[PDB]
């Protein structure tokens, strides 16, 4: 990429979420969403492999129709209130549209089909951006409008996502898609507490970002899109085997690690609000997510899969190092739990 183009695109992919967050005029929030859609598509097809064009053409159609639905909500509001922004008075259907639409861009629940497929055809790098710096934008729009959205729908999309994400993940063996599925799940918890305590959504996101960003830079350190590929981690780079183990169990909710806090406080907030029906079912299938996380643990760490002689060759050569971010985001993530009170 002519480095100039790289700058323009990257600026847009970054001006995209930032305009959304900063503005209050919904319109300006919509174009922030629009710029993110335009900026991400070029990077998605960088290899320009036949799989890639498929990825982008799906991502784009799914993103575009949702963008149009979000605009329709703003256009309708404009006629039910002269304001260009959702208010207490807003017709309920107007808000529900925004939930469905925004739940498509974020890819939650019954609209979770595009994400796993686009996460499969894009590079590991652009995978991260597509999973974590593109969720900030829509979520911002929701978090702003939380007082007004429906508790019922969110919960249904929340629970569905948790289930779909978990069930989908169990079968998958491609890593990119295992992560895509996890993101659907975590995204679910996040949207469950939005109606009740938005501030916790912003924790269940950061922690997801501080967990997923190290996890993916791990997958690419050896650029392994297969579990079999990550399983030979012990030969290619032995040290990351320890933290890859804890980060994945952290992604699932197991108690000593940082990953428990988001689930724990979301459950505490939902029980405070009396959803002890919903919270219970979510926590239970949340346990399904750890099963596929630990199955990967087995292959990568607890058991040593057989490797190839040609690997001895890759050991010889100095391994290009993992950026510092890996460490700082691996530790702050695997073990901050002793510092939970200040996080929330």
């Amino acid at each position: 990429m002519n480095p100039i183009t790289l700058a323009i695109i990257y600026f847009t992919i970054f001006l995209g979420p930032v305009i959304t967050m900063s503005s209050t005029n919904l319109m300006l929030m919509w174009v922030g969403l629009e710029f993110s859609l335009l900026a991400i598509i070029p990077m998605l097809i960088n290899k320009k492999n036949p799989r890639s064009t498929e990825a982008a053409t799906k991502y784009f159609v799914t993103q575009a129709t949702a963008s149009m639905i979000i605009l329709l909500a703003i256009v309708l509001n404009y006629k039910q209130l002269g304001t260009w922004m959702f208010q207490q008075q807003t017709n309920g259907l107007i808000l529900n549209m925004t939930l469905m639409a925004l739940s498509m861009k974020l890819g939650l629940a019954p609209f979770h089909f595009w994400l796993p497929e686009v996460t499969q055809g894009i590079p590991l790098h652009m995978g991260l951006i597509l999973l974590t710096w593109q969720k900030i934008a829509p979520l911002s729009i929701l978090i702003q409008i939380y007082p007004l959205l429906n508790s019922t729908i969110i919960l249904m999309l929340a629970i569905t996502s948790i289930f779909m994400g978990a069930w989908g993940g169990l079968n998958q063996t491609q890593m990119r898609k295992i992560m895509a599925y996890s993101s659907i799940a975590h995204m679910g918890w996040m949207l469950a507490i939005l109606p009740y305590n938005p501030s916790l959504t912003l924790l269940n996101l950061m922690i997801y970002i501080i967990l997923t960003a190290p996890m993916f830079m791990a997958l690419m350190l050896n650029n392994s899109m297969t579990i079999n590929s990550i399983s030979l981690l012990w030969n290619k780079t032995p040290a990351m085997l320890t933290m890859i183990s804890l980060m994945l169990l952290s992604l699932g909710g197991l108690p000593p690690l940082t990953g428990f806090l988001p689930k724990w406080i979301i459950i505490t907030e939902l029980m405070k609000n009396n959803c002890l029906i919903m919270a219970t079912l979510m926590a239970m299938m949340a346990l399904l997510n750890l099963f596929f996380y630990t199955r990967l643990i087995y292959s990568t760490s607890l058991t040593m899969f057989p490797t190839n002689n040609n690997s001895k060759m890759m050991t010889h050569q100095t391994k290009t190092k993992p950026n510092l971010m890996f460490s700082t985001l691996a530790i702050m993530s695997t073990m901050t739990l002793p510092l939970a009170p200040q996080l929330i």
């Binding site: 930032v18 959304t20 967050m21 900063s22 503005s23 209050t24 929030m29 911002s140 702003q144």
Partner: peptide, 8 residues
Amino acid sequence: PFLDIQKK
């Protein structure tokens, strides 16, 4: 809004 870089 979410990040009030405007008022600031």
